[PDB]
Design an enzyme around this catalytic site. Structure first.
Site, mmCIF file in Angstrom:
data_model
loop_
_atom_site.group_PDB
_atom_site.id
_atom_site.type_symbol
_atom_site.label_atom_id
_atom_site.label_comp_id
_atom_site.label_asym_id
_atom_site.label_seq_id
_atom_site.Cartn_x
_atom_site.Cartn_y
_atom_site.Cartn_z
ATOM 1 N N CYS A 1 26.420 -2.990 -0.973
ATOM 2 C CA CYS A 1 25.398 -3.966 -1.337
ATOM 3 C C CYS A 1 24.987 -3.843 -2.767
ATOM 4 O O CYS A 1 24.678 -2.767 -3.236
ATOM 5 C CB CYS A 1 24.152 -3.852 -0.468
ATOM 6 S SG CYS A 1 23.623 -2.154 -0.183
ATOM 7 N N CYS B 1 21.163 -2.823 -3.548
ATOM 8 C CA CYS B 1 20.845 -1.443 -3.315
ATOM 9 C C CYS B 1 20.971 -0.568 -4.528
ATOM 10 O O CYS B 1 20.344 0.470 -4.597
ATOM 11 C CB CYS B 1 21.706 -0.926 -2.188
ATOM 12 S SG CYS B 1 21.686 -2.052 -0.780
#
Ligand code: ZN
Lengths: 48, 998, 59, 48, 116
Positions: free
Chosen positions: E39, E42
């Site tokens: 991700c 993140c």
RNA sequence: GUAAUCGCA
DNA sequence: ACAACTGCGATTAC
DNA sequence: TTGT
């Protein structure tokens, strides 16, 4: 505690007396109050 | 594991080299040491190699640089001496010597001097297979085998088979004889070799066979061999194979080898040099051990191991290496960029390498192998052009001594992505395409065509066949070239000039970041080493100018700052706090900002308003007209610190004594001196003053005076007592003066795009041309340089800078932005200017009729100029070369002892030289008297010169000298020392008499 | 018209302190002395002193 | 324009005397700025 | 770790570690972060968690759990998406706070100070 | 006073 | 065996 | 080295 000498002159001043009385340091000063200026000339449309 | 997803550290090369050295090279050298046994009883001493342990330095770096001491580590190894009579071996640990340690930045401290180890490019050992065409007949083919020591076991073939080695100076040598001497029985030789018909039809040793591991591998590659890597020796099978290939070359089954290919070259790092130095030191140590054993036998005493070994060889070897080796140079610390760019240099010239004259033209050109591994625009200008080059940003040094570059693999696989540091020889057999994929022609995207590289060539192929892709933007350049914004719009020739001129910048009193940049200044300032980076997380509890206190995990760490120090190139170093008190800082963030760095980015110049127009001739050639605002606002002020030191050398007759009261000197001087013979801190001094006063009894007055141009405040003085020299040493008194230098006529200024100039006039702001805003331009440049030197990126920069200044933005642009579209730089520049014009309603910034150009007025008359001019704010740097340093003038002061000509050098107050190319011009003009005066009484004629001052002071005419100059008299004396006579012997035409002139 | 590549990537704040712990910067550089000490390449003076004292006591 | 820029005069600090500083390129305990920084700050003091 | 300090202060715990921490007794607030290397958001969340761990040296415990290694555990925790933060209070009667998406560091500080 | 090394134009 | 740009300036090492 |  610090001492200051105030003078009134024109233009910019070069700190010439670097070698002088001890304990006093000379600072170059710019005596120009006006920062910038500009002008523009527009017509009036009055014919002749 | 690192550098495959981000730009690697600039100093990682020296780091990993020193790490590999300490890891394996020390043990490898200690293993090969022989067992000292030189006696009839054979008393044997041994060094337990397993018990090898280095010890931390006793002093710190800040103490080593202050006290002019080396920063090294103590090597302690347990040794066992088995005495003859004792019949037992006592085991003790001995101090062999000191080994210098490297800083995290790559530099080493030896005798208080910062020194760097430049890498060297040397040809790898192997078999080379060159060919040479004869004047008449078939071309001659030769194969050379190169050894680690440098042996050349050549092999040649004539029009016939004629497999002849060129080892002997004679005509030739029999390859069959060499094979038989090797061990071949003349039957297995023909059985194993291919094409045995050709071989059968035809009817020192250790160094040549000292092939390295690298040599073994290469031999195996070119000549298919299954010899294990371990057997690093010239086997006869290798020779046999070599012969086979050689004969095969005659029939066309072969390929000659390119000796300019990187795969054929090795790189020697600091580890390779330190390993050889340690081996030489071990040899000296073994010799000293044998000598001291021989002496102890003479003195009838069995001594402890400590008595045998002395710490002299290691220390003296490393000191001599760092002092006199051609690959150990003092670090250039003019600016933070120099510290990083100095350690990336790769040099062909050096010990065991091509000398300037020796180097062929071929050696100095780019080879397709240099792509991504070496910089193609960074060289050394001069006789060594193409021999000294830098190292690519993303390069690494490989296991086999080869530079490796990161290539993405677009081939489909399990991971589907890889970043591999392919070696030079491997990337040749791959389709490497540097183009993008943003093209569709109503077919599958993999059917599109793209330029690519294969077999050291360029070609266009489909996207199905491309194996590799070069994604990194800064892969093919170096730190110097990558700091040039819009490098695509500038010529490749000017790129080298710009890279060389970026190195000259002087750190200014105040620092300002650049509006336009490439984005590499951040990592440049990070790896420069002039920045305070925390090594622990925590909070800044106390903030002070001298030190910073960082409290973390119940521990407080103090970081000492640098306050007005001095570099090797007379440039001030200073640090200022960036973080305020009470904020958290991670392990790696910036605590303080050093010189020429603000906000964590490299800042070597200022941003000033610039107009490109001719102004009354003051811009002719290259010359800049600047305003007084740069002067009275301290825009380009810089501080320079120069040191002067005189040692109190103690002569055998009498030691030098430092006293303040010295007679025979005027009362105008000596005012600055204290009770002791040294100047006081905070004292302004000038030319001709006395800094240190010495009686010098041996009395006289060997003092320290200031030379012409030295006018600065005395910041600090150091009394350095010298110890560790095995005896009492002279004290050293080092004074430091700080000269504040402003911008003046005669100073050089430059831009990052290769534009260089010398200031010619400082006009006031009222006379300077002003824009429609009302502001006077800071500098005016000549617009005719752009077509001459082909620098178009400067225009872009200027414009983007104006836009940024108005909109308060900073642009960090990666090079080659035209990979996205066409005219990407133009679109970006015009878009940002329009926005600036709209947001701050200054219509002038973007003129629809002529984008990027405005119409300015004249400061003197007030009338507008006819054509529009370019208005922008580029990044201008102030270069190190300065007029004050270059000013010089001599009247009549000092002469050489033997030549008696005036002295050389500006510091020595010497005159200028009239060379042969100027005597020729003087003779062509016909000025015989001027040439005679310069050749006799202004140079060498002692009597005439003595009389010249008197005749000039009195005012009388100077007579023409008739005696021979001291240079001729010297020649006569020399030639007569060589038993050769020389007499003038002029003959009078009046009375036909010969008169000798002596 | 507007450029295909976003200009916001090039735009940077003038008075911005560069964070060297970002995704585009490498790992922090370890001090050579501490890096060699942590891996056991270079021992401290205390260890050498203890070894020498033990060797002297044994003799 | 030429009168406003160069023909108007003002007043500024021209000399500074410090008590117990060795030189103008050093640091005094208790102050975050060096003597040179203090001089540069006093240089930009506008007076009438 | 005596000579060289660790660069990252947040440790990757497993699901059993989280179960033992929740089951046991705690004297400091607990922060659980689910992340995945894939991700993008993140990457930023991790930097803010590092800053928060530096700001809270020993007054709070910050751990991270990889969703790739423990997918069933993350699914059982009612985790919709990756930038998710679980704020566990020290007293075991109060209710845990779950935050999703990128949130400012000041919001995390205020939550830890007041809600937990 | 000589070398080494770099720069300059 | 012989020669292969002209000079200048800076540093450190002897 | 490159050629003389
Ligand atoms: Zn471009």
């Amino acid at each position: 505690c610090i001492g200051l000498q105030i003078e009134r002159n024109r233009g910019y001043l070069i700190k010439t007396p670097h070698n002088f009385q001890d304990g006093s340091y000379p600072i170059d000063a710019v005596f120009m109050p006006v920062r910038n200026a500009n002008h523009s000339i527009h017509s009036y449309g009055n014919g002749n | 594991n690192e550098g495959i997803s981000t730009i690697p550290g600039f100093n990682q090369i020296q780091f990993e080299g020193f790490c590999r050295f300490i890891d394996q090279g020390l043990t490898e050298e200690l293993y090969k040491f022989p067992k000292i046994e030189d006696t009839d009883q054979e008393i044997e001493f041994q060094l337990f190699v397993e018990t090898y342990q280095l010890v931390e330095p006793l002093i710190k770096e800040r103490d080593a640089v202050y006290e002019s001491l080396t920063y090294s580590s103590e090597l302690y190894v347990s040794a066992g001496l088995i005495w003859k009579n004792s019949r037992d071996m006592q085991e003790q640990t001995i101090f062999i010597g000191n080994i210098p340690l490297m800083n995290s930045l790559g530099t080493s401290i030896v005798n208080g001097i910062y020194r760097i180890v430049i890498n060297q490019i040397l040809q790898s050992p192997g078999i080379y297979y060159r060919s040479e065409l004869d004047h008449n007949g078939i071309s001659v083919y030769t194969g050379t085998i190169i050894s680690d020591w440098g042996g050349r076991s050549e092999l040649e073939i004539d029009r016939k088979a004629r497999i002849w080695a060129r080892v002997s100076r004679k005509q030739k040598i029999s390859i069959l004889v060499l094979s038989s001497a090797m061990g071949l029985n003349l039957r297995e030789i023909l059985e194993n070799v291919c094409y045995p018909e050709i071989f059968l039809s035809f009817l020192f040793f250790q160094q040549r066979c000292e092939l390295g591991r690298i040599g073994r591998r290469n031999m195996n590659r070119r000549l298919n061999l299954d010899i294990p890597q371990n057997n690093t020796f010239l086997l006869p099978r290798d020779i046999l194979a070599a012969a086979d290939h050689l004969i095969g070359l005659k029939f066309g089954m072969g390929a000659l080898d390119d000796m300019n290919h990187l795969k054929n070259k090795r790189i020697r790092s600091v580890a390779d040099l330190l390993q050889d130095q340690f081996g030489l030191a071990l040899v000296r140590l073994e010799n000293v051990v044998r000598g001291t054993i021989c002496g102890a036998i003479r003195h009838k005493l069995i001594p402890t191991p400590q008595n045998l070994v002395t710490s002299t060889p290691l220390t003296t070897t490393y000191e001599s290496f760092f002092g006199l080796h051609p690959l150990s140079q003092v670090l250039d610390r003019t600016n933070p960029l120099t510290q990083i760019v100095h350690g990336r240099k790769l040099s062909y010239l050096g010990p065991g390498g091509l000398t300037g004259r020796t180097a062929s033209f071929r050696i100095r050109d780019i080879h397709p192998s240099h792509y991504g591994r070496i910089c193609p625009i960074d060289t050394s200008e001069g006789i060594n052009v193409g021999l000294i080059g830098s190292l690519a940003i993303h390069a690494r040094i490989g296991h086999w001594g080869s530079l490796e570059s990161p290539f993405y693999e677009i081939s489909e696989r399990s991971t589907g992505v890889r970043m591999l540091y392919l070696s030079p020889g491997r990337d040749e057999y791959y389709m490497v395409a540097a183009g993008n994929s943003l093209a569709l022609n109503q077919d599958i995207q993999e059917e599109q065509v793209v330029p690519a590289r294969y077999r050291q060539e360029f070609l266009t192929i489909a996207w199905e066949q491309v194996h590799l892709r070069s994604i990194f933007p800064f892969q093919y350049f170096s730190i110097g070239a990558s700091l040039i914004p819009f490098i695509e719009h500038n010529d490749a020739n000017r790129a080298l000039m710009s890279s060389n001129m970026q190195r000259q910048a002087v750190p200014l009193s105040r620092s300002e970041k650049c509006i336009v940049g490439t984005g590499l200044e951040r990592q440049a300032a990070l790896d420069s080493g002039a920045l305070a980076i925390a090594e622990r997380e925590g909070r800044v509890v106390y903030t002070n100018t001298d030190k910073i206190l960082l409290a973390g995990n119940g521990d407080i760490l103090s970081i000492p700052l640098v306050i007005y120090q001095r570099s090797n190139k007379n440039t001030c170093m200073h640090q200022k706090l960036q973080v305020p008190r009470g904020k958290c800082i991670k392990k790696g963030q910036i605590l303080a900002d050093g010189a020429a760095t603000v906000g964590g980015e490299l800042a070597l110049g200022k941003n000033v308003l610039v107009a490109y127009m001719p102004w009354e001739g003051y811009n002719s050639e290259d010359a800049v007209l600047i305003s007084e605002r740069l002067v009275y606002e301290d825009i380009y002020t810089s501080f320079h610190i120069r040191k002067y030191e005189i040692q109190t050398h103690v002569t055998s007759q009498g030691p030098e004594k430092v006293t303040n009261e010295i007679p025979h000197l005027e009362a105008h001087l000596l005012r600055n001196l204290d009770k002791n013979g040294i100047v006081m801190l905070g004292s302004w001094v000038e030319t001709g003053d006395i800094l240190v006063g010495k009686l010098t009894p041996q009395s006289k007055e060997t003092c320290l005076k200031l030379p012409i141009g030295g006018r600065g405040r005395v910041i600090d003085v150091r009394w350095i007592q010298k110890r560790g020299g095995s005896s009492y040493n002279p004290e050293t008194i080092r004074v430091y003066i700080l000269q504040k230098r402003e911008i003046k006529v005669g100073d050089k200024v430059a831009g990052r795009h290769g534009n260089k100039g010398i200031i010619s006039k400082i006009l006031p702001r009222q006379d300077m041309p002003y824009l429609q805003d009302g502001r006077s331009v800071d500098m005016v440049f000549n617009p005719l340089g752009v077509p001459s030197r082909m620098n178009v990126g400067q225009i872009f920069e200027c414009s983007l800078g104006l836009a940024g200044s108005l909109l308060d933005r900073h642009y960090r642009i990666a090079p080659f932005d035209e990979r996205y579209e066409q005219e990407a730089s133009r679109k970006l520049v015009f878009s940002e200017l329009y926005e600036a014009s709209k947001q701050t309603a200054n219509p002038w910034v973007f003129e629809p009729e002529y984008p990027g150009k405005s119409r300015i007025f004249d400061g003197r008359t007030g009338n507008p100029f006819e054509q529009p001019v370019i208005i922008g704010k580029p990044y201008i740097l102030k270069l190190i070369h300065q007029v004050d340093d270059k000013i010089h003038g001599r009247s009549s002061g000092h002469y050489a002892l033997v030549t008696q000509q005036p002295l050389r050098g500006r510091a020595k107050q010497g005159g200028q030289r009239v060379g042969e190319m100027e005597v020729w011009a003087l003779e062509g003009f016909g000025v015989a008297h001027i040439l005679q005066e310069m050749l006799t009484y202004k140079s060498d004629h002692i009597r005439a010169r003595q009389e010249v001052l008197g005749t000039t002071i009195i005012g009388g005419t100077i007579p023409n000298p008739e005696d021979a100059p001291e240079s001729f008299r010297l020649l006569v004396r020399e030639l007569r020392s060589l038993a050769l006579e020389l007499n003038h012997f002029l003959v009078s035409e009046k009375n036909f008499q010969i008169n000798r002139k002596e | 018209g507007d450029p295909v590549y976003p200009t916001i990537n090039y735009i940077q704040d003038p008075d911005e302190v560069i964070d060297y712990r970002g995704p585009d910067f490498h790992e922090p550089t370890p001090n050579m002395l501490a890096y060699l000490k942590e891996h056991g390449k270079i021992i401290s003076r205390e260890e050498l002193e203890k070894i020498l004292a033990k060797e002297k006591t044994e003799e | 324009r030429r009168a406003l820029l160069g023909e108007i005069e003002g007043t500024c600090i021209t000399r500074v005397k410090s008590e117990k500083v060795p030189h103008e390129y050093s640091t005094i305990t208790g102050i975050q700025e060096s003597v040179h920084e203090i001089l540069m700050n006093l240089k930009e003091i506008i007076l009438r | 770790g005596k000579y060289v300090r660790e660069d990252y202060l947040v440790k990757k715990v497993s699901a059993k570690d989280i179960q033992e921490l929740i089951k046991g007794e705690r004297n400091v607030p607990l922060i659980i972060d689910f992340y995945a290397t894939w991700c993008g958001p993140c990457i930023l969340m991790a930097q803010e968690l590092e800053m928060l761990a530096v700001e809270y040296e020993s007054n709070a415990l910050i751990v991270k759990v990889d969703t790739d290694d423990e997918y069933e555990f993350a699914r059982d925790m009612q985790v919709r998406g990756l930038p998710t933060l679980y704020f566990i209070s020290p007293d075991p009667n109060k209710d845990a706070i779950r935050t999703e998406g990128l949130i400012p560091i000041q919001m995390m500080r205020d939550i830890i100070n007041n809600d937990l």
